[PDB]
Homo-oligomer: 130 residues x 2
Amino acid sequence: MADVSQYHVNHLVTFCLGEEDGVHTVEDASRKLAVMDSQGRVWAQEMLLRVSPSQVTLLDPVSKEELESYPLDAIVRCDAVMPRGRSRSLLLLVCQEPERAQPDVHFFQGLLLGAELIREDIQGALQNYR
Amino acid sequence: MADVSQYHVNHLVTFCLGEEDGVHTVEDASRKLAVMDSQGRVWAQEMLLRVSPSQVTLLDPVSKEELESYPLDAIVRCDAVMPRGRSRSLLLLVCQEPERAQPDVHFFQGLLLGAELIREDIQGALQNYR
Ligand SMILES: [Ca+2]
Ligand SMILES: [Ca+2]
């Protein structure tokens, strides 16, 4: 428990989810992440992920300026997963931003704190908010 | 000419552009906007669009808080268009955000100032920046 916590993570990829792309489960999403990675579309970018009781914020690790923010009302799902062929956990966040026609899948690689700890924190903040 | 100007607009829709969706031209995009609208996916939301010499910013018309921002380096195209069956101009902005796997199309309805005036301002700011 902490109202505001931060974690350093590496953002790996954000991609839109359409009703006809065949991507329906966390597992389908991890598989599309591995395809993307084999096409040279995934490049790790270090970021600061901040969970507060009203939103999840992403910041530049040095400048501390806000790169993106998702109010908790915009998060539709948060999971942590270890795809086949990886010793690590990925943090998956699906958001439906109000202005966008489709939801997006965001994948993050956790560093020392893993994705499981961040998943519990966001899910605790979601339960609370909701 | 003005380094920073603002315009009130209505955001209509933002959607991702994929290499296999058949959407290649401004005209294809206006047609997909009309399909979306006939599926009940388009709802006008009033916003403040600000052009500065380093970025395009979208704000809530009252609270003035930033809703989104696109550094000029992220804009790949800006056009104004009058689709068939409309007496008005739409402002089209295509952006490729660094973190996203695909570019997005954003459509805005201009109000009293039209989309043509905003297109020239962003294109002037793009030329300058570039
Ligand atoms: Ca917490
Ligand atoms: Ca200007």
